[PDB]
Design an enzyme around this catalytic site. Structure first.
Site, PDB file in Angstrom:
ATOM      1  N   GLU A 216       1.372  -0.971   0.080  1.00 27.73           N
ATOM      2  CA  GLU A 216      -0.048   0.395  -0.024  1.00 27.73           C
ATOM      3  C   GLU A 216       0.966   1.421   0.014  1.00 27.73           C
ATOM      4  O   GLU A 216       0.820   2.489  -0.176  1.00 27.73           O
ATOM      5  CB  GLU A 216      -0.815   0.143   1.069  1.00 27.73           C
ATOM      6  CG  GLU A 216      -1.725  -1.012   1.167  1.00 27.73           C
ATOM      7  CD  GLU A 216      -2.759  -1.583   2.757  1.00 27.73           C
ATOM      8  OE1 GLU A 216      -2.761  -0.335   3.662  1.00 27.73           O
ATOM      9  OE2 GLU A 216      -3.461  -2.075   2.701  1.00 27.73           O
TER      10      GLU A 216
ATOM     11  N   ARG B  93      -6.558  14.888  -9.258  1.00 28.16           N
ATOM     12  CA  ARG B  93      -5.447  14.946  -8.892  1.00 28.16           C
ATOM     13  C   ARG B  93      -5.592  13.924  -7.298  1.00 28.16           C
ATOM     14  O   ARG B  93      -5.179  12.614  -6.932  1.00 28.16           O
ATOM     15  CB  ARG B  93      -4.535  15.291  -8.944  1.00 28.16           C
ATOM     16  CG  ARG B  93      -3.390  14.925  -8.793  1.00 28.16           C
ATOM     17  CD  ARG B  93      -2.406  16.363  -9.069  1.00 28.16           C
ATOM     18  NE  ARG B  93      -2.191  16.588 -10.190  1.00 28.16           N
ATOM     19  CZ  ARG B  93      -3.513  17.622 -10.725  1.00 28.16           C
ATOM     20  NH1 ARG B  93      -3.651  19.153 -10.285  1.00 28.16           N
ATOM     21  NH2 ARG B  93      -2.597  17.837 -12.263  1.00 28.16           N
TER      22      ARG B  93
ATOM     23  N   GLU C 182      -6.015   0.636   6.960  1.00 30.81           N
ATOM     24  CA  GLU C 182      -4.932  -0.767   7.567  1.00 30.81           C
ATOM     25  C   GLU C 182      -4.300  -0.997   8.791  1.00 30.81           C
ATOM     26  O   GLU C 182      -4.426  -1.666   9.893  1.00 30.81           O
ATOM     27  CB  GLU C 182      -3.764  -1.027   5.748  1.00 30.81           C
ATOM     28  CG  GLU C 182      -3.358  -1.663   6.769  1.00 30.81           C
ATOM     29  CD  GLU C 182      -3.211  -3.350   6.315  1.00 30.81           C
ATOM     30  OE1 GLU C 182      -4.535  -3.700   5.101  1.00 30.81           O
ATOM     31  OE2 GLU C 182      -3.084  -4.064   6.949  1.00 30.81           O
TER      32      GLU C 182
END
Lengths: 116, 104, 115
Positions: C28, C49, C63
């Protein structure tokens, strides 16, 4: 149950008031949040830019809240048990930082296209 | 891990079912409206975020209950803290849709 | 300014820990910088963006919070001698929705761009 919504809403304000009182880092960020939120509401930008300016900063709030909840568990565990690696608290700390770095990058990119 | 927790939250949590409906509903409505990519993304990502947080909330509640059957001040503090994070995500989703759709 | 330096150290200690231990985190981390590189190099408007980078960074946040919960369950699961990974499941479920959300974002964004 419709009242189930007013119940879970009660548990929430309890945790917002308790976050603001015990957690010091939540107070300082909440300042920079409400400031940035107001700034976004007065900046002459598009609805996409405005939402992106507001949401990025409010994510810092949400993440910090989850971090405070985790710490309350480590503290709970820390009362029964003696040693604490404090590695869980270290991970929740990193998550908040990444949320901030995100909001910083968001605001810069959005304003440097705007003001640029 | 993944599908085991989504089926667990769906069968158990009532507020999660209402968000599962909301997520799929949001995906549809975002696709129907004549809006640009960023608008469509923000319309969906905001609602999906509410789900992401609610899952993390239910994850914490699961730990709090497994620690002790007994309510402590610090354990009650934990549950209420996570419940607040879900609210901000919900409000964030509300603000998002308003700014986008009022402009449309 | 002494409390801020203290907290940022906890965050580096946390990031360095997640990197060394969690393989999925390293993937990641690669994704974020790659997302940044890809989003910037493409002649792409500001909001897109941001959304290209934000969506991938959100994954890293979830995470990290997930790995934080995993650490608590393992402190319990070491002193409690009882394992009911109900919490570890709900954590991984969140990261999945973060990833799905990221893919959808990149899809809709890059689909519209090259449309």
């Amino acid at each position: 149950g419709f009242t189930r919504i007013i119940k879970a809403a009660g548990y929430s304000w309890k945790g917002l008031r308790a976050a603001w009182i015990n957690e010091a880092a939540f107070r300082q960020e909440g300042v920079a949040v409400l400031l940035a939120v107001v700034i976004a509401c007065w900046l002459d930008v598009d609805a996409c830019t405005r939402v992106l300016l507001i949401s990025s900063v409010m994510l810092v709030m949400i993440v910090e809240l989850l971090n405070s909840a985790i710490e309350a568990v480590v503290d709970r565990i820390g009362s029964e048990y003696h040693e604490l690696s404090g590695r869980a608290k270290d991970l929740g700390s990193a998550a908040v930082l990444i949320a901030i770095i995100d909001a910083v990058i968001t605001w810069c990119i959005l304003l440097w296209s705007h003001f640029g």
